[PDB]
Amino acid sequence: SATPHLDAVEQTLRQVSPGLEGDVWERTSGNKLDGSAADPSDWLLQTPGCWGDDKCADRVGTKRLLAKMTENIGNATRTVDISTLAPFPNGAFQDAIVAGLKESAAKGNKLKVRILVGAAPVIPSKYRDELTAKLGKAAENITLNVASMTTSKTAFSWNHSKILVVDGQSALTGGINSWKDDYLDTTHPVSDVDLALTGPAAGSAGRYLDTLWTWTCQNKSNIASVWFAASGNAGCMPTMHKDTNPKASPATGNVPVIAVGGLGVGIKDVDPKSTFRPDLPTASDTKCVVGLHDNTNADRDYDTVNPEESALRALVASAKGHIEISQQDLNATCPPLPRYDIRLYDALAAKMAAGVKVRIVVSDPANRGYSQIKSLSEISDTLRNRLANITGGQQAAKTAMCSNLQLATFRSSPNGKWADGHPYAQHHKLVSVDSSTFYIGSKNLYPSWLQDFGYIVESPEAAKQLDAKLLDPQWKYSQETATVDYARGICN
Numbered sequence: 001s002a003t004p005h006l007d008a009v010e011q012t013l014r015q016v017s018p019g020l021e022g023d024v025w026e027r028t029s030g031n032k033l034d035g036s037a038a039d040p041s042d043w044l045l046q047t048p049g050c051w052g053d054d055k056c057a058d059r060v061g062t063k064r065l066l067a068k069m070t071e072n073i074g075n076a077t078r079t080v081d082i083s084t085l086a087p088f089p090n091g092a093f094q095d096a097i098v099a100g101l102k103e104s105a106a107k108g109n110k111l112k113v114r115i116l117v118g119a120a121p122v123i124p125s126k127y128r129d130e131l132t133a134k135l136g137k138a139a140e141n142i143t144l145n146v147a148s149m150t151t152s153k154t155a156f157s158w159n160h161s162k163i164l165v166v167d168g169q170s171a172l173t174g175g176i177n178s179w180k181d182d183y184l185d186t187t188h189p190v191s192d193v194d195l196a197l198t199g200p201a202a203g204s205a206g207r208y209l210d211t212l213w214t215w216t217c218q219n220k221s222n223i224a225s226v227w228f229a230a231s232g233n234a235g236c237m238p239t240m241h242k243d244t245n246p247k248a249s250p251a252t253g254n255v256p257v258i259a260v261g262g263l264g265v266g267i268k269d270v271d272p273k274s275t276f277r278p279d280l281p282t283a284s285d286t287k288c289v290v291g292l293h294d295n296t297n298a299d300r301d302y303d304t305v306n307p308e309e310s311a312l313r314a315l316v317a318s319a320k321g322h323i324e325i326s327q328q329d330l331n332a333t334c335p336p337l338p339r340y341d342i343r344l345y346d347a348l349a350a351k352m353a354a355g356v357k358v359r360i361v362v363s364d365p366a367n368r369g370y371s372q373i374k375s376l377s378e379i380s381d382t383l384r385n386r387l388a389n390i391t392g393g394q395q396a397a398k399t400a401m402c403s404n405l406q407l408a409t410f411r412s413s414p415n416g417k418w419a420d421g422h423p424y425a426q427h428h429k430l431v432s433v434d435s436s437t438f439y440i441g442s443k444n445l446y447p448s449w450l451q452d453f454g455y456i457v458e459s460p461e462a463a464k465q466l467d468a469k470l471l472d473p474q475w476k477y478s479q480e481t482a483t484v485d486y487a488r489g490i491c492n
């Protein structure tokens with residue numbers, strides 16, 4: 001097959017979540033990574049994109065990101081569909097949205113617009129008011145829905161997807177929250193990444209958002225769950241995508257993609273169609289406390305409504321040569337979450353035991369919002385212990401790990417911190433295998449029970465661009481913090 005990695009992932013998803021095919025995950029063909037003529041790699045919306053410079057003077061990444069947001073929205077003829085994590089977009093992110101909506105209104109278009117945020121237990125109506133003011137006459141051309149939602153207080157579940165879909169044709173998604181203080185107006189900007197695509201896979205994102213809004217509209221009169229605000233006399237639009245855009249979006253290229261998300265906890269308890277029967281591993285030191293219910297490692301039904309967890313573990317399992325992972329963290333803060341995904345660490349171990357190389361780069365613990373560990377030893381110890389189960393003991397586990405792992409914290413310049421003294425924070429949710437197939441999205445690899453979304457893209461050309469523009473510069477500067485690095489025999 002031309003697509004061995006997606007074939008494997010697709011087969012797993014159809015066993016895990018068959019009833020959610022089309023809506024929460026979907027394989028499509030005919031897509032395009034949406035870069036410019038001049039710089040074809042700039043579908044890769046990294047921020048800040050100021051490699052080598054501890055002062056971050058020339059933020060080519062940030063400029064392109066904000067410009068691409070405006071360009072895509074300004075091309076809307078029917079719908080704009082945005083999700084993110086609260087707070088609502090501010091600063092130049094909000095400016096970009098407003099600018100795009102004004103551009104589309106002046107080209108003559110009448111638009112339906114939804115903006116959904118996930119929130120912890122006045123904000124939505126205030127945001128609607130601010131946007132309506134900033135739009136001026138353009139607001140006459142726009143039917144707006146704005147909502148903040150929480151699906152489970154007890155499971156800490158709410159939207160965390162970060163999606164911008166226009167006309168079901170174009171989609172931007174990834175790890176970037178629309179937060180001016182963390183990303184923009186700061187001399188220690190967070191390092192993150194979104195991708196831009198067009199084609200049928202943008203339709204998949206539209207159907208995911210209909211899934212979320214269908215729940216949101218149903219629960220709009222439950223004030224523990226949902227705060228909703230609309231323009232004028234407009235009702236809630238649970239199915240704007242299905243009602244307004246073509247069931248299959250037009251084709252734009254030749255790129256195969258798997259869209260995959262999850263429903264967290266509190267929208268749907270199980271996929272009734274699923275006959276998935278997982279062999280669940282044995283835990284030990286993930287569930288720091290006894291009373292906690294562990295959806296990541298010990299809840300089959302949870303898997304069936306959260307195909308993305310399985311998808312990421314299958315993507316790892318598909319690698320023949322090498323895997324690069326760039327995350328904020330691999331481990332979560334316990335309680336209330338378990339420390340780590342046992343199956344993920346087992347899949348990485350299985351790979352290293354077979355001589356497939358694994359790179360993990362995470363955020364500097366000196367950040368501990370943007371870190372949940374004290375030391376990289378909390379990742380290497382865990383990997384070693386899981387390797388021990390399949391190499392016959394601790395010595396043979398350490399050897400396999402030191403021969404096949406690169407483990408480090410992130411830097412983007414020769415300096416150990418930003419010039420302003422603040423550590424580098426990284427927030428990517430990125431996995432690439434084989435210079436071939438990659439995930440960019442909102443789903444962290446650390447235990448999390450949220451609604452998330454991303455794309456798995458199989459395109460060697462695109463993956464090489466990802467190497468050149470992000471992973472290679474990343475390892476160039478980050479490798480100086482490595483505790484394990486097989487390529488230089490480092491083994492601490």
Ligand SMILES: *[PH-](=O)([O-])[O-]
Nearest residue numbers: 085160175177444
């Ligand atoms: P996310 O915005 O919590 O990773």
